[model samples]
Target chain A: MVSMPLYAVMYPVFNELERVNLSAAQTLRAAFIKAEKENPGLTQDIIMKILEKKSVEVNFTESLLRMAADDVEEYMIERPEPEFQDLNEKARALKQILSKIPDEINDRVRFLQTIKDIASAIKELLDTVNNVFKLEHQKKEFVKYSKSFSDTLKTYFKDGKAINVFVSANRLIHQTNLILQTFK
Target chain B: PGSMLVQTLSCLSMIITPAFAELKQQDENNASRNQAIEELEKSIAVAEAACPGITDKMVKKLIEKFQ
Candidate 1:
């Protein structure tokens, strides 16, 4: 392993984490458009605050996961204690929040299954990335799960709505590809 | 986009208007009905690509009524 400090090796992870935040927010906005279909009284404009609220925690978790990964990687090199305790704590908080999202909207939309699957895939990525030791295998699994989730989402939309999720999924997959390339 | 939009709307109306009338007036041949359905399916294939925003739900009632 090449000798490196924490900040030196963590830039790519930080960049990828920020991209995940943006892409995840875009995907969430696309998914929440279904809520307007289920409840015609509330257009997406009316639900903007709700969408923003739902996005905040996911973005937060993405950063925390990146931090957790950095700490583990650094500790692996330097013999210091890794923040595994905090990492598991972040995972628990994220899982609790993600599991509650589907129930937030009504169950009348055509794409409810797609939304649930997206959430599950993100949660899986969060858990996978938080494990610095297993990062190699986890990154591969991330690509696999993200691709499958993108396929499942593709089956649901056909309009501009479809474009939103596809663009978002492509960004995430592209970022994951960069990570795997670096690993190779 | 504009011409494509016009084509999609016209294609939809073209297929649907004839399909409606034919479905109503067909006192004779299952062959014509089958042919009409096949034609509708083809037009829909083209029109759907041209008008990706138009959904199955939008055309559901017409298809169901014709059937």
Candidate 2:
């Protein structure tokens, strides 16, 4: 529950804010908690000051998106699935992306753990795709796996941050047909 | 039994997606959601002693998701 800036006067305002939004409520909670701690006598005034601070930021990764798209094009056209190295390389890149996900965000730890697990499993599969026929089949499976990968990435990423990996991978999939036309 | 919990939490990762999607909404319910989530994280951290792959990063990330 959010602490009221002014136990009797400001309680109703934050309660109303809580009723309206989860993020806002949490923000108010943190502000009031700090205000109460820092300015016991002027809690409401301090919280009002905290509430006036600026917070919005642009949340997209322009360069990372482009680089990942390039990788996808190379992945499809170069047919790295047969060699395993290609898949491993992409997996490594994804690992880098996963590593960069900040620990401060909510539930990001859970999100990162589960994803690193799946990615590790997927990377392990690279050892088994030596046969051309198996490679072809695994290529299809990889696409399916990538979809799930992207979906999970989309989670834990909803709060005002650019999920460059998900956005890039998603674009790669959607732009596949067009990209494939060049190879054909 | 330890393996069972690992598998369960792993599977929970999948089944919990929609639930998390709801959590992401940051609606009024999230206070309760985040409360349970934070406590759930501590349990997971404790499990890391028995579970090999569960790392401090994993536990930390889990808490950040809801906090």
Candidate 3:
């Protein structure tokens, strides 16, 4: 029987995809900025060219990540142990929060704050998963905490903070790309 | 002076009209670009959920790589 940790199978591929994605994202932004600086006006052509050039890399990263996701799913299915089951549930909850992150680039500040909270939550969840049998008490409390956090997140989105119009679209894209690189 | 004012106004309109038109076009392109980014983010989110915290470790590596 070939047994290995589920994450061990996925992490290296994901880590490499993340690096390529981050590099491509940064290169795209940099190319756009450099082009805009040189051209001085009417950036539509410049943006189109930059995006076209970087599309290959961007697409490749996304495709690889999708494959890795499928592999993780298969691994989880193969081993229906309690530990993997718990991790899957926690991962699902985390995914719900992550998918809800607003598309608005001006919301970068709010987005990073949310990411910070999620990272801490994941850490706590990991700890719970490690001590699943012995720390049943902590697991229950973590569930309660996750529910409360989710409720708070709903309120946060409802408020819909004002957008900062002064931020340029290019700058917003750059910031968004950098922030997203933090996620695998 | 009246003729000079007319010339100045014509020049200003010539400059402003194209500038506004270009801005509108850029805005449209930006909307499309943002949508693309959103799509990419959604895919990345799925992968992240499959194997959580690969991101956190990558983040640490990023900091180290840069420093």
For each prediction in turn, the share of the native Cα contacts (below 8 Å between chains A and B) that it retains comes to 0.00, 0.00, 0.00
CAPRI band of model 3?
incorrect
| Candidate 2 lDDT, A1-184, residue by residue in tens | 1222143234434454444454544454454454445424344322222222212122322322222322322233445444444444444454344433433224667756756654664454343333322435445655565666566567536654446444444333333322232322
Q: State interface RMSD in Å for all models.
A: 21.3, 16.6, 14.9
Tell me, by lDDT, which candidate is best: 2
Off by over 4 Å in 3: A1-71, A77-81, A95-105, A132-184, B1-67
- What TM-score fits each model? 0.22, 0.22, 0.25
Mind giving the per-residue lDDT tens digits that candidate 3 earns over A22-54?
A: 543333333334434433432333222232432
TM-score of chain B of 1: 0.40
- The model with the greater DockQ, 1 or 3, is 3
- DockQ for every model, please: 0.01, 0.02, 0.02
lDDT of 2 at B65: 24
